[PDB]
């Protein structure tokens, strides 16, 4: 029946909606267009913090990298400031979760290495978790530009909820790494209008947005009853039909939100 309210939204946003909450012992799993194929957009910038953090010992973070003005290309509010300075590998993290920073999520690839600037290596990265299915190729920000039909920089709702659950709930880094990541998330700053704005604020919510073109708008969270019970929450949209310069519209991902409120009370 949740099905018709998703649906519901669908057809009054003009848009696709894709839904995945994992299962817990006491609730069943929410499912719609779960296993279909949406562009990630900004939303991979969570796994690639951890992927530094594991393949990295804690006094990486104050190791420092210098960029010419020629390496800024996308987004980039934090990057642009500090050309001078240099961000240190865990400034740069703060920049690429709390502020979608697109340069300092770039240099975060340089920092993993191989081909493709560390693209082959972060894909490997989503492998180690069991995501077979993900994978990112291209940089900030031809990501955004891909053409819908395309399996490239694509993940799935039921792909990237399960990565998030391992990353945060699970036991996929170490309590001291563990604890950046998540409080990197739960003071990010784009997050308003999307998840947050359609559960109750008493719930707790973390959460990593990402927007691109042909109307792209996501949202990946983990939320908190009143009682501290967890779940996890993956929202994901797009509009096709209106061109490669669609508005994205972000009441869609707050309104479905709000569906899953009701069903987790
Ligand atoms: C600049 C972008 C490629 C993309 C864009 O070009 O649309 N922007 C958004 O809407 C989020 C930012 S981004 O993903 O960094």
Not at 33 to 38: H, K, L, N, S
Not at 93 to 109: E, F, K, Q, V
Not at 135 to 140: I, S
């Amino acid at each position: 029946d949740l099905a018709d309210r998703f649906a519901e939204l669908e057809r009054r946003y003009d848009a696709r909606l894709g839904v995945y909450v994992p299962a817990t012992g006491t609730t069943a799993a929410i499912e719609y267009r779960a296993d279909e194929r949406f562009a990630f957009c900004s939303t991979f910038k969570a796994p690639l913090v951890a992927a530094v953090l594991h393949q990295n010992p804690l006094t990486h973070l104050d190791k420092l990298i210098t960029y010419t003005s020629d390496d800024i290309r996308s987004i980039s509010p934090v990057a642009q400031q500090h050309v001078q300075t240099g961000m240190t590998i865990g400034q740069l993290c703060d920049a690429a979760i709390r502020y979608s920073d697109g340069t300092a999520a770039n240099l975060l690839l340089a920092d993993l290495g191989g081909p493709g600037g560390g693209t082959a290596a972060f894909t490997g990265y989503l492998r180690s978790l069991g995501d077979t299915v993900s994978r990112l190729d291209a940089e900030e920000p031809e990501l955004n530009r891909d053409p819908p039909g395309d399996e490239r920089d694509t993940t799935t709702p039921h792909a990237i909820a399960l990565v998030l659950q391992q990353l945060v709930l699970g036991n996929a880094l170490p309590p001291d790494k563990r604890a950046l990541l998540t409080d990197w998330m739960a003071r990010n700053t784009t997050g308003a209008k999307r998840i947050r704005a359609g559960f109750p604020a008493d719930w707790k919510v973390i959460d990593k947005t990402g927007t691109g073109d042909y109307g792209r708008a996501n949202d990946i969270a983990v939320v908190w009853s009143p009682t501290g019970v967890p779940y996890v929450v993956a929202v994901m949209s797009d509009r096709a039909g209106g061109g490669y310069d669609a508005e994205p519209r972000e009441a869609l991902l707050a309104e479905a939100a709000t569906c899953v409120a009701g069903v987790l009370a």
